[PDB]
Amino acid sequence: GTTRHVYDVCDCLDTLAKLPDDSVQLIICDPPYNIMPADWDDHMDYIGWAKRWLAEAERVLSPTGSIAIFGGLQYQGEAGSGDLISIISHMRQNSKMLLANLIIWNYPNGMSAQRFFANRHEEIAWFAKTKKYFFDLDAVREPYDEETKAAYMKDKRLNPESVEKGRNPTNVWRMSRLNGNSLERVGHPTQKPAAVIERLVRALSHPGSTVLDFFAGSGVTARVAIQEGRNSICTDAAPVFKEYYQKQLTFLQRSYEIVEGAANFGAALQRG
Ligand SMILES: [Cl-]
Ligand SMILES: [Cl-]
């Protein structure tokens, strides 16, 4: 089949307001963790600002849909800022969504530290709209080296089926952060590695379904959606997004259609 991808520079709420209820299958959410100076006109803290798109994110997700929210757990208390805990706490008090998993993204390198343990992790809260959420475990199982599985097939106590399928990747993923010399680089400083996004897309969304990202940043979600046979809608408030997004396409240089303009969101919503 052929997938559709719509993109545009927009404010998250403005994007969400144009999407119908239960219209998207998966949402990739890597939000800012501090509000803007202007936001201080209508809010007194981070969650006050974030609860708006959080509620909307839930509305646009279908019954089988899910949202993956990246965030840290070491927020220090500055006004107007917060972290993944601030979001989870809020969700526990005001949302009916289920916390399916708290995934730990454990990366190999980082800065050193003398007065504490060097930070080597970031979290991913996977919230499912309902208990009927979609989940393709097989699509993300990790294979066993030709020998290790040969030994498991000898062990009659183990289920042959499970052996060939592969292992559950667990809720701790050891994946390398995107390095400065990596070809994936589009210029976005906090660009997430395609590997993490891929795993989320393959396990939490089905082929041909729609993936949404209103904090698209580098547009990695669109690149991964295209590669995995999913439709997508990516918007970012920064005008530089267009440039990144195009750069993101030059890498792709198995048929898809790219469509610019919020007025065309519908193209990526059609189930096909
Ligand atoms: Cl790393
Ligand atoms: Cl990104």
From Swiss-Prot:
E.C. no: 2.1.1.72
UniProt keyword rRNA processing, yes or no: no
One Pfam family per UniProt: N6_N4_Mtase
Regulation of activity: Strongly inhibited by N-ethylmaleimide, inactivated by MgCl(2) or MgSO(4).
pH-related activity note: Optimum pH is 7.5.
Disulfide bond sites: none
GO molecular function annotation: DNA binding; N-methyltransferase activity; site-specific DNA-methyltransferase (adenine-specific) activity
This protein's record includes keyword Hydrolase: no
GO biological process: DNA restriction-modification system; methylation
Top EC class for this record: transferase
Catalyses which reaction(s): a 2'-deoxyadenosine in DNA + S-adenosyl-L-methionine = an N(6)-methyl-2'-deoxyadenosine in DNA + S-adenosyl-L-homocysteine + H(+)
Family, per entry: Belongs to the N(4)/N(6)-methyltransferase family.
Protein name: Type II methyltransferase M.RsrI
Protein species of origin: Cereibacter sphaeroides (Rhodobacter sphaeroides)
